[PDB]
Amino acid sequence: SELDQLRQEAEQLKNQIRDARKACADATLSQITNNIDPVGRIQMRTRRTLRGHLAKIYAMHWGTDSRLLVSASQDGKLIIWDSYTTNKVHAIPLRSSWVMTCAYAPSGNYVACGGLDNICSIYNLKTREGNVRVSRELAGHTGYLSCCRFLDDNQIVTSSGDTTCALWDIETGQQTTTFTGHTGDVMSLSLAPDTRLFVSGACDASAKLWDVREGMCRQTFTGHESDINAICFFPNGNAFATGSDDATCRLFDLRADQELMTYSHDNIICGITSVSFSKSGRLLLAGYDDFNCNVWDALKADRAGVLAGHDNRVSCLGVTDDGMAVATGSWDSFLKIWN
Amino acid sequence: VQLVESGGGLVQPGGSRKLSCSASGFAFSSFGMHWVRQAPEKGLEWVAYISSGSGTIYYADTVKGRFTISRDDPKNTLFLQMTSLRSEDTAMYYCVRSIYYYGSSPFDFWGQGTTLTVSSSDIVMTQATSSVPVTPGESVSISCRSSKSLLHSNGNTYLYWFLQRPGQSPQLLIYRMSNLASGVPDRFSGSGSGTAFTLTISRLEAEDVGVYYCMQHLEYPLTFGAGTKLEL
Amino acid sequence: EQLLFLYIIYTVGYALSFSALVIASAILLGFRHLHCTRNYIHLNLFASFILRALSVFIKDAALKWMYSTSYQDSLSCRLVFLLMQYCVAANYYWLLVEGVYLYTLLAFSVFSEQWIFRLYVSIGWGVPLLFVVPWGIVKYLYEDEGCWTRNSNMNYWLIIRLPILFAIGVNFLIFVRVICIVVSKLKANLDIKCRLAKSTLTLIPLLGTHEVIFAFVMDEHARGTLRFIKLFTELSFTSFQGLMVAILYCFVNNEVQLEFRKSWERWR
Amino acid sequence: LSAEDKAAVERSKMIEKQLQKDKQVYRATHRLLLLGASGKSTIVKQIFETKFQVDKVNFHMFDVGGQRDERRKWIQCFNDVTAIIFVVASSSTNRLQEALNLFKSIWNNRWLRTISVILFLNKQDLLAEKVLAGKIEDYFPEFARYTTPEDATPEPGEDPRVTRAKYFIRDEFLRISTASGDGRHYCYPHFTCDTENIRRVFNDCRDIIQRMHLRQYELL
Amino acid sequence: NTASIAQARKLVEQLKMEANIDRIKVSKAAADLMAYCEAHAKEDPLLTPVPASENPFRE
Amino acid sequence: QVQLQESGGGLVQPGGSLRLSCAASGFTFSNYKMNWVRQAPGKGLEWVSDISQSGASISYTGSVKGRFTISRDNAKNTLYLQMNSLKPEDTAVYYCARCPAPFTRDCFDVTSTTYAYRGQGTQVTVSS
């Protein structure tokens, strides 16, 4: 039964990796940041309330212009808001009503949305024929789609419920590579700022780091007790934050291949369903599941800010590319923008 | 894409007619729509305006009462009723597309147009000059001045540029005085500041000679300049 | 001799009841979250009370303040009399609106919400006008009196009553059907006495059916202090209904309760 | 002040009015989640999406036969679903216990805490000849102490013991349902089997509607 | 049983690849992130407050 | 890592006894309700037992109640299953599982042999 020997070097390799991580975790983050000054309870308010969605706002995404933002509701509605004039720039009916994610191309010319039909639909915004239309039906996944993010106007990276992330050439219509290796459904992928690599958190408590071109994993991290719901790379592209059903967040630093901090509290017992850093990084927006969102001092793991606002599950979150606000889309069908 | 105006031609003074615009190939209903007139060998001027969903009509002083504007979205076709006709209306009329949201490019397509023949306060736009001799290869700088500031309190400066080649409908080139249009080569580039504006064309070549119109959109009525002719 | 003491003791109580009722209207108004077309039927109905208790409280000075100090028999009297005698039908028709919406929810399943709500605000405000304007015509032309006095004839004070009787009858009937369907659910399911006690005693004060609880035989309790007993029962039940609709649909409603709980949660 | 943003706001209010229109067409359609282990091809008599109608009331039923069998995430989606058609077989391999723990999980989930289930116990007749010609106690022991309560109307002709088995299964599921959270939601267990179960779904939807309204009015 | 054979082989090669990488001290990582946060700490409108003119959601 | 080691199991005669056990690292063992699952050769899987956070509320499959017993020492972070009066049909691989998320009465564990928070499994054979 040579497989037993296989498991044997597997477990000794796990022991070797953990021992090396002990040899690399020789002073935790909280030890040295202790000497630094606090921040103070940030008194963020609402600034706008976007109210046009017939069903739970399940996903959201700003645009690079830091004014427009797309939002997807599971009544089957993908609507592009302008914030300042709070106007419904576009409102898009979908081929199927159940969607778990929207995406806004950094060029601003496309949006992408997908969900329980496994497909990623990419819609052309800046068409010259008037109304917006679905440019591409990226249909190769076997489970549902949970996150989609744009590299550029032509290639999309999409994580599914079949435990595979993927890279598609949008123009071609077929998948560039299949980032396979996970054991639980991928729940959130986060592109590195340089788009040379990206993290993905899944329902096996493990976060994987891949190489966008070689099409193969490069690291796995495990410091979170339960399924990973949300993930967001640091502005550096060196660390990332993960949020899980354990009701805590974790910093996974990419160079040290391990964890740095935990964001936990005695009161919180609800699975956090969204996460994202601010632009600088010193704050961390964790959209919890007791209807609130918390603002964690990422370098202190204290709770500073509390954005309450909502009257249901906050199912998405995202800061502007210029750090101008936070959009929170809950299950009460309101997007609250916060300065 | 396909804005075919029709109905024009001969008229008697003070008579009546019904100009139409068969508009096909796009999202007709979502498009606000304009009409614009050009006296046979004079500049441009906006005539009448309807909105999306027929929800707001605007008229220029010279045409209110005498002109009617309407649309038929199911038939996908615009309409203008000419009544109380004067001699100053023997001109070519252009059915005009325009859509307004954040970052849009209105006036994105002016139809072919049709001529009408009938025979017996604002923001003033100072053009550069009617005609300017020019040859290919170098860079040209068409100037423009405004009576008021076109820059708004919101942040946008509301000036548009159009180019008319001989014997065809003019084309939008720049919108909000800085932003290039779709299908228009980087060769053209407009800019300016409050009540001072310019269209600069580098690498000038053929397919570039015509009339250059400097119009505004800060408020209704919509104004124009006479149009700077360029040559060969 | 004595019921005057009841009136002058409950004047402030009824004013503060009006106050609690407008307070409950404000609570169902402001939150932006308790808003729903089920609550706009409520939130106006409370105003139809606010139209009444204004009358019996601020009409009181029509018999005290002006009689504390004959020309007043101009419009300035009968117009305020019509204000009161119209707000009465406004109340007795907003109770009917609430009932008809109850039946609309619990009966049929395909109908536009905003359209039906506009139809209800009409049927709740117009109809008292549409049958108090003929009262205006008659009591202006055919038997007009000073300040439009109590009851000129048998069939000419029928004007204000017969449609109000229709409203009260429809409220009772829809109440009976609501209770029939409630108990049908309850005994079709997989201690009821508390259930039906609390249920019906909440369903009656809202629909305003108590009047037809003690309205079988008339013109026989007119002696032996029985007339004053009837006055006490009817006046107390009506002057309580204003407090009670608010108390049972604005203070004991779990939705507004959890709204206040979360609001205080949001008050650090 | 809305110089060119006036036309923007005009198109915004036009699209917002469109949002009102499809609010009319949404709040009046019944989203129900199929959850299999049939009639779904017949319940659309009138691939994943399935739209149909009963008494001018329109039903949008989502089947989920396209996912991997780890549901703890792609089921939260249906917290706003009207009902869950929980199509479970009557002949159990141990199918009845897996179905039982699936039903229990659905009932207990924090998002589906307030969703009524419609239980369909398929193939009851097939179970009838299966357990008649030759078993139940071989999987559930407490079937030996069980007898049909007098408030259970049988289908005449078959064995009271077959009816006893059917109602034992139904009594297990309703013990689940009542064991926690009768305050918000209720199981409506039918006994499928080739009739119009569409009528059963429709009547149960009416029952759930009326119960929710009576519960906001503080009556039920 | 060969599915587990293949999966164990692929898992173990992946373990080898992830084990034979460089790895830096959490002292280095934490100091780097702290320096980044203290540098770009006057350049983000979420943590860093901005007057009510150019917080263009205000009104 | 959320790892669940199991121990105990082998060839035993019918009617015997056995105490298969589970040592779990990688979570606060208190917060979840544990499980025992099994796969009998030629068959899929099935769930056998349940024990809550405190272990107060417990459950079994019909064909093992009274016979088998499930206990958990949260202080020692371990889950025990005492099998007694076994049967030839009880030969199967036994996996110690934990429910996906904490502080809940919800569980989605058994699968088409595709689940993340179960141990590797101990064989248990009951034959001569």
Numbering used by the authors:
A (entry chain B): 2 to 340
B (entry chain E): 2 to 121, 124 to 235
C (entry chain R): 139 to 207, 219 to 339, 344 to 421
D (entry chain A): 12 to 48, 51 to 59, 207 to 252, 263 to 304, 307 to 365, 368 to 394
E (entry chain G): 5 to 63
F (entry chain N): 1 to 128
Give the published text:
Tirzepatide is a dual agonist of the glucose-dependent insulinotropic polypeptide receptor (GIPR) and the glucagon-like peptide-1 receptor (GLP-1R), which are incretin receptors that regulate carbohydrate metabolism. One such molecule is tirzepatide (LY3298176), a 39-amino acid linear peptide possessing agonist activity at both the glucose-dependent insulinotropic polypeptide receptor (GIPR) and the glucagon-like peptide-1 receptor (GLP-1R). To investigate the molecular basis for the pharmacological characteristics of tirzepatide, high-resolution structures of the GIPR in complex with native GIP (3.2-Å resolution) and of the GIPR and GLP-1R bound to tirzepatide (3.1-Å and 2.9-Å resolution, respectively) were determined by cryo-EM. For class B G protein coupled receptors (GPCRs), including the GIPR and the GLP-1R, the N-terminal ECD is a unique structural feature that is implicated in the mechanism of ligand recognition.
Interestingly, during the processing of the GLP-1R/tirzepatide cryo-EM data, three-dimensional (3D) classification revealed a unique class of GLP-1R/G protein complexes that showed no density for tirzepatide, a totally disordered ECD, and a wide-open extracellular pocket of the TM domain. Given that tirzepatide has nanomolar affinity for binding the full-length GLP-1R, and a saturating amount of tirzepatide was added during the sample preparation, the presence of apo complexes points to the hypothesis that tirzepatide engages with the GLP-1R TM bundle less stably than the ECD, consistent with the two-step model proposed for class B GPCRs.
